[PDB]
Ligand binder design. Structure first.
Ligand SMILES: [Mg+2]
Ligand SMILES: [Mg+2]
Ligand SMILES: [Mg+2]
Lengths: 166, 166, 166
């Protein structure tokens, strides 16, 4: 973790011992990583200018960049590969499809979803149970029962997956 | 390759000795890399949950993520920078434009192409000789003679390019 | 910098001593990096086939890939996270929004801007003072006074930010 955890302005990340951090991830400055979280290969959480909080049981998948107004990510959140997250707030069980961009001041409420490849623009609010999609992302429809159930299942799957590394 | 090749659940990648693997690439678990393939900087081939196969003479360019239903990539395939490939099948001489996302169960037939920045959604089939583009990607037109010739040329160029590293 | 700077065909990068280069960046071959530039985590500047020039005071943010017709990037340019730049020319004070793709032969004139998530296609010219957006990117509007001022401010902010690492 000597190469993985980087200080900025005297602040170093606080990482729960049960979190999985890929050896080539980079976590800089004011970043807190909760119990059973998993931060994947090539992910960059750059908390130099403002803070990043990552809740229990959250996965931030490969090559995602988080940087900024801080970034607050709740519990059991799934962030797909190669996302870009910028001073946003993601509620518990939020699901961000791979290849999505979430802009400054955007909010995903608890149990909401963004389709793969979405661009959620500044200040937009995805409400609980909603699926948004597109560029710029807009409300598409409510989620099905299967999709809602998958929010927690995805997070649990990733906790289990990450335990096969450590 | 000690840092580059990562075991998962007792399985480590099988890499042909003639393949180029960038020193900061990460290849995990059940992944097979063929003769003269080239896997570029910051690429992540994560074969933890299911297998990834990469055929002879294929290039997977920088910062691409492959992860999942397995991912089967044929021979002399070009995958551009910063793509995301998810349980898909790419036939020989398929060409995936940089910054594209290929979703679960999508298929590119032999000698087909996706434009840069495309989003090929679940289960869609790009037929041989076709060029698809957009988000969601849809049929645009057939490829020109020059474009069809370029499928093999791109792959050969990358084999030659990669030999200047090793 | 032993792992960061990579020779290709006998050519190694030329990096100003005042430039910040993240320890996991990869800079290959014919690449020149100017005074006070900053090249961020997971960025790949691959100057194997042709040259890459990066002017004074320019930031190229995390996980961006630059590769190709060469790539000429001027002074005090801001390139956002996870961009892909391909044989293009970016004038002084150009601003490329995060998650954008700039294709071969595209030009951004001095003091022009691309919105986040744009796809600037081959040979397109963004004129000074213009904001382009979309996929394919097209002229949206001229920039406001605040936006024009921000071009230089962004670059100065990044110089200052990078000095807290070195
Ligand atoms: Mg930023
Ligand atoms: Mg995946
Ligand atoms: Mg290229």
């Amino acid at each position: 973790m000597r190469e993985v955890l980087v200080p900025y302005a005297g602040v170093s990340p606080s990482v729960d011992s049960t979190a999985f951090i890929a050896g080539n991830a980079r976590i800089i400055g004011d970043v807190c990583i909760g119990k059973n979280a998993s931060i994947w290969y090539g992910t960059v959480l750059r908390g130099d200018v403002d803070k990043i909080e990552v809740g229990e049981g959250t996965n931030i998948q490969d090559n995602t960049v988080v940087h900024t107004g801080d970034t607050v990510i709740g519990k059991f959140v799934t962030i797909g590969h190669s996302c870009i997250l910028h001073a946003c707030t993601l509620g518990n069980n939020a699901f961000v499809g791979m290849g999505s961009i979430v802009m400054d001041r955007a909010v995903m409420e608890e149990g909401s979803m963004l389709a793969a490849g979405s661009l959620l623009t500044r200040g937009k609010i995805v409400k609980s149970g909603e699926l948004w999609a597109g560029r710029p992302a807009k409300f598409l429809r409510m989620m099905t029962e299967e999709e809602i159930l998958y929010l927690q299942k995805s997070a649990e799957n990733y906790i289990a997956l990450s335990r096969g590394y450590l």
